C-alpha cells in the first residue's frame, strides 16, 4: 500500500532490452538470474544482441549481482543497496537521456542502504514549477551498473544501465503540464525562414 | 476533479499512489487547484 | 522517374522535447517527405503534439515547426548516395549517429538545403567501413540519420530540450552492421574496465 | 552462399529490407567476400 510502482526498463549498450512495471510492498531487486524485494531478472544478452565481445562483458556483469541491486520507498526516501559485486553509480535525470551533465548523483553502498531520491524536495519543486518556475522537477533514476557514470563517453557505450521510474512521480509532473506549467526555455531560437 | 488532469492511463496502483501524496501535502493539492 | 525496386526502407522514429511520439516504416520507390499528392515522395505526416505532449508551451512551439514545414524534408536513395531536401520553412540539421543517441560528438554533419538536394549519406564508405570491421577495426559503421527541425543542432544543450528531433534509418544498413556482430566483430573498446569487487 | 549469409540476420523487420539487404550483396561481391572469410 505504501509501495511505489517502479517501470524498469534496461539497456545494454544502448538498446533497450527489457522493461517490467512492477508495484511491490517490499520494493525490487534488479538480478542476474533465476530475500525480501521483488526479483526482476535482467535478460541473457543473447535475446537481443548480436555482438559477442558486448555480450560476454554483460554476461560477466550480470554474473556479480549477487542478491542485487534493491531500491525500495521507505517514507520520504527511495532507498538502495547494493547486494553483490557490481560497483553501481546512479543519477536522476530524465526519460530518454541518462546524463544530467552533473556527473552521478552518487554511488550505491554495499554495507547499508543509502537515499537515492527524497520526495520532500520533488514536491517543493512540483509546486514552484506550477507556480512558474520553469523547470520541471526531475523524477527517472539511472543506474550504471559495473562502470563508472558516462561522464566522457555517451552512455550508449555502456555495457548495462537501469532506468527506474516512479511511475506516480511522472504522474504528478504531467499533472501540473496539463495545468499549464512549461519548462520550455525562454531563450528559445526557431531557425525559420 | 484534480485526477481528471490525469491525462495518461495508469494502473490502479499508480493512482492510489498519487493519491496518496495529494492526501498527504494539501498544499501540493492547494497549487494544482490555484493553477486552475 | 526513380526506378522501383531500387528506393531503401526508412525507420522514422519522431520525438518531441526527448518523448517519442511516432514511428513509421517506410519504403517507397520515391523515398519520403517528412511533412505537418503533387510532389513525389511518400509524406509521412509528424504528429500534432496534442496527442502525447501535455507542456502547452512545447506544444505551441512544435505546432509552430511543424506547420512551416511545407512540402516536407524530402529524403530518398538514388544511387551510392542518400538525398535530402527541405521544402519548407524550416532550417534543419542532419547527422549521422546512434539508434538512441543523436549527438555524435561533432556536432552536426551538415544542413539540409533547400535550391537542389544535398547529400546526406554515401554507400562507398559504409561498405568500406562495414568490411574494416569485419576485419577487425573494431569501430561499427554509423548509419542512423538524426534530423534537428527548426532550431540548431544541440551542441551545448542536452538533444532532449529540441522541440523536434527526428531519427530516420535505412534498415537494410542496421540489417547489415548486425549481420557483421553474428558474423563475430564487435566494437567493444578495449578499454572497458569493469568495477566489480 | 547468399541465402546463407541473408540467415544470419536474425530479426529480418521486412521482406524489403531483406530484397535491399540482397542487391548490396550482389552489388558489392568484395562485401559478400568479407561476410564469408570472417
Request: charged fraction near 20%; glycine fraction near 10%.
Given at each position: 500500500?505504501?509501495?511505489?510502482?517502479?517501470?524498469?526498463?534496461?539497456?545494454?549498450?544502448?538498446?533497450?532490452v527489457?522493461?517490467?512495471?512492477?508495484?511491490?510492498?517490499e520494493?525490487?531487486?534488479?538480478?542476474?538470474?533465476?530475500?525480501?524485494?521483488?526479483?526482476?531478472?535482467?535478460?541473457?544478452?543473447?535475446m537481443?544482441?548480436?555482438?559477442?565481445?558486448?555480450?560476454?562483458?554483460?554476461?560477466h556483469?550480470?554474473?556479480?549481482?549477487?542478491?542485487?541491486?534493491?531500491?525500495?520507498?521507505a517514507?520520504?526516501?527511495?532507498?538502495?543497496?547494493?547486494?553483490?559485486?557490481?560497483?553501481?553509480?546512479?543519477?536522476?535525470?530524465?526519460?530518454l537521456?541518462?546524463?544530467s551533465?552533473?556527473?552521478?548523483?552518487?554511488?550505491?553502498?554495499?554495507?547499508?542502504?543509502?537515499?537515492?531520491?527524497?520526495?520532500?524536495?520533488?514536491?517543493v519543486d512540483?509546486?514552484?514549477?506550477?507556480?512558474?518556475?520553469?523547470?520541471?522537477?526531475?523524477?527517472?533514476?539511472?543506474?550504471?551498473?559495473?562502470?563508472?557514470?558516462p561522464?566522457?563517453?555517451?552512455w550508449?557505450?555502456?555495457?548495462?544501465?537501469?532506468?527506474?521510474?516512479?511511475?506516480?512521480?511522472?504522474?504528478?509532473?504531467?499533472?501540473?503540464?496539463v495545468?499549464?506549467?512549461?519548462?520550455?526555455?525562454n531563450?528559445?531560437?526557431?531557425?525559420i525562414? | 476533479?484534480?485526477?481528471?488532469?490525469?491525462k495518461?492511463?495508469?494502473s490502479?496502483?499508480?493512482?492510489?499512489?498519487?493519491?496518496?501524496?495529494?492526501?498527504?501535502?494539501?498544499?501540493?493539492?492547494?497549487?494544482?487547484?490555484?493553477?486552475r
Open positions: 500500500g505504501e509501495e511505489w510502482e517502479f517501470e524498469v526498463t534496461a539497456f545494454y549498450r544502448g538498446r533497450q527489457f522493461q517490467q512495471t512492477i508495484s511491490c510492498p520494493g525490487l531487486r534488479l538480478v542476474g538470474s533465476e530475500l525480501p524485494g521483488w526479483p526482476v531478472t535482467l535478460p541473457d544478452p543473447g537481443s544482441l548480436t555482438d559477442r565481445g558486448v555480450m560476454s562483458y554483460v554476461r556483469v550480470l554474473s556479480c549481482l549477487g542478491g542485487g541491486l534493491a531500491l525500495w520507498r517514507g520520504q526516501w527511495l532507498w538502495a543497496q547494493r547486494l553483490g559485486h557490481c560497483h553501481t553509480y546512479w543519477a536522476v535525470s530524465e526519460e537521456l541518462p546524463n551533465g552533473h556527473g552521478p548523483d552518487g554511488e550505491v553502498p554495499k554495507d547499508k542502504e543509502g537515499g537515492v531520491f527524497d520526495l520532500g524536495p520533488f514536491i512540483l509546486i514552484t514549477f506550477t507556480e512558474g518556475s520553469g523547470r520541471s522537477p526531475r523524477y527517472a533514476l539511472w543506474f550504471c551498473v559495473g562502470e563508472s557514470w561522464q566522457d563517453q555517451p550508449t557505450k555502456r555495457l548495462v544501465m537501469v532506468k527506474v521510474v516512479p511511475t506516480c512521480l511522472r504522474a504528478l509532473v504531467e499533472m501540473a503540464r495545468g499549464g506549467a512549461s519548462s520550455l526555455e531563450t528559445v531560437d526557431l531557425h525562414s | 476533479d484534480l485526477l481528471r488532469t490525469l495518461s492511463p495508469s490502479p496502483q499508480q493512482q492510489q499512489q498519487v493519491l496518496n501524496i495529494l492526501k498527504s501535502n494539501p498544499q501540493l493539492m492547494a497549487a494544482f487547484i490555484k493553477q
